[PDB]
Write a protein that binds this ligand. Structure first.
Ligand SMILES: [Ca+2]
Ligand SMILES: [Ca+2]
Ligand SMILES: [Ca+2]
Length: 184
């Protein structure tokens, strides 16, 4: 019930957690999920702490699929800690790559319109009960309407990775973050 030296090392290489933190996380993850596999229903219960279960469920399924890199139906500790590390301590570039893999539902390497609207509908449903939204990006259709007409360079009905990454950096919260670049 400690990571084997060889696995510990492999995870220190593929994450931004220290040994102690990986050790602590493995203990916790096992203590909370004695099987060492986290399924969809379990994951939705994690999300339901933060937002009503029924509301968050469709977003929680989309995220679960992004964590589940081999797409077998469950998240093992490697898949979980890696995915957590990227999203919580990753570089902004690779955060947004990970978000792109999520938005791109068929995995053809292009965010289609009906792919975008799906995810945004789920994000809006999850938060509907607590967040009050802007006004112009304040229905999913309204929001999705903004994105493509701020992001679709050629207007090929699709968003490539490159159109997405750049587009997102105007997201107001990313505009806040860039003012903290330690390259003053
Ligand atoms: Ca899996
Ligand atoms: Ca696609
Ligand atoms: Ca395009």
């Amino acid at each position: 019930s400690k990571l084997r030296p060889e696995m510990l090392q492999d995870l220190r290489e593929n994450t931004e957690f220290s040994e102690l933190e990986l050790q602590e996380w493995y203990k916790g993850f096992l203590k909370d999920c004695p099987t060492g596999i986290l399924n969809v229903d379990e994951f939705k219960k994690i999300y339901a702490n933060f937002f009503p279960y029924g509301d968050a469920s469709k977003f929680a399924e989309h995220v679960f699929r992004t964590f589940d890199t081999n797409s077998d139906g469950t998240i093992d500790f490697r898949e979980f800690i890696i995915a957590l590390s990227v999203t919580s301590r990753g570089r902004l570039e690779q955060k947004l790559m990970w978000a792109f893999s999520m938005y791109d539902l068929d995995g053809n390497g292009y965010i289609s319109r009906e792919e975008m609207l799906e995810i945004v509908q789920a994000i809006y449903k999850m938060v509907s009960s607590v967040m009050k939204m802007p006004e112009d990006e304040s229905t999913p259709e309204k929001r999705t309407e903004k994105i493509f007409r701020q992001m679709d360079t050629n207007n090929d009905g699709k968003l490539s990775l490159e159109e997405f990454i750049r587009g997102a950096k105007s997201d107001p919260s990313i505009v806040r973050l860039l003012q903290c670049d330690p390259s003053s």
